[PDB]
């Protein structure tokens, strides 16, 4: 919910710096990812409604124990709000931030063998919307810069024409590029249209609307932080600053 609310590149990377890896990993068993299932949608149909479960749903799924599953759990958390079930990763890796895993070699995780095409296909890039594809491409660029695979990232964009048009423009080592970026990455937000307490047909759409309706409740909740009215009560370390720089950028 909090990760889906971020609407700018600066906010997204700032959230990932303060968020540990354990938030990406889920400890609920879930179900196997790719299955043709029948779900109940009584608002629309009397018969059961066919659908296919996927990894970018908002509900936890079972994940492979390899490094591929860990990266695929991080991206699903960013684009869908929930991760997958990969237990016994370890204290050392789980305490690191999401940005450290994606960008830093000191974590101890080796990810240079990853194939962006296979990861995108397993994440069902075809079913993703524009904001979801932009968020995943941000994760790919950070991984490419960590492994020195910038050339491979560019070629993968050349093969996929729709991905090249929406590819965010920022150098993963320079903070000046992040501040200038004006891409809108928000998935949930205050809706200008009429939003009703109604169900959706597919699993992805229904789960997304739950976060959208939950965010509205979160926005008016006491947990939400109102910068306009309570800026002085925020701690100085985590207070918003114009000259905000990620470490090493």
């Amino acid at each position: 919910m909090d990760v889906l609310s971020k609407g700018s590149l600066k906010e997204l990377l700032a959230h990932l710096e303060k968020t540990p890896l354990e938030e990406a990993i889920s400890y609920r068993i879930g179900t196997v990812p790719y299955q043709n299932v029948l779900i109940s949608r009584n608002e629309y149909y009397n018969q059961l409604y066919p659908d296919t479960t996927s990894l970018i749903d908002g509900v936890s799924r079972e994940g492979q124990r390899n490094v591929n599953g860990l990266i695929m759990s991080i991206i699903s958390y960013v684009v869908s709000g929930s991760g997958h079930y990969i237990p016994n990763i370890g204290f050392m890796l789980l305490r690191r931030s999401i940005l450290d895993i994606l960008t830093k070699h000191d974590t101890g995780l080796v990810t240079n063998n990853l194939n962006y095409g296979i990861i995108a296909r397993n994440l069902t890039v075809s079913k993703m919307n524009c904001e979801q594809r932009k968020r995943m491409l941000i994760c790919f660029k950070l991984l490419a810069y960590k492994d020195g695979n910038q050339n491979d990232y560019e070629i993968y964009l050349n093969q996929n024409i729709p991905l090249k048009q929406i590819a965010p423009n920022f150098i993963p080592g320079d903070m000046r590029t992040v501040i200038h970026n004006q891409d809108q990455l928000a998935i949930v937000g205050i809706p200008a249209y009429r939003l009703t307490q109604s169900t959706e047909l597919s699993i992805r759409d229904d789960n997304a609307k739950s976060y959208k309706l939950g965010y509205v409740d979160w926005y008016n909740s006491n947990s939400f932080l109102r910068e306009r009215s309570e800026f002085n009560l925020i701690r100085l370390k985590d207070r918003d600053t114009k000259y905000g720089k990620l470490n090493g950028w």
Binding site: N113, N115, N151, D152
Partner: protein, 53 residues
């Protein structure tokens, strides 16, 4: 001191790329050379074929 020959050599481009590790499920991974002495399955199969000839 190692022997240094001034022999002119052509540039060599690896299949692995700049990161020096091949990507999974790629055409380059399928055409990569792989060890024959270290692997037991291949070092056994080649001896059998050599004996047959």
């Amino acid at each position: 001191q190692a022997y240094s020959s001034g022999l002119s050599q052509n540039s060599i481009i690896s299949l692995t790329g700049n990161d020096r590790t091949v990507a999974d499920g790629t055409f380059n991974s399928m055409i990569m050379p792989r060890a024959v002495i270290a692997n037991e399955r291949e070092h056994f199969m080649k001896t059998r074929i050599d004996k047959i000839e």
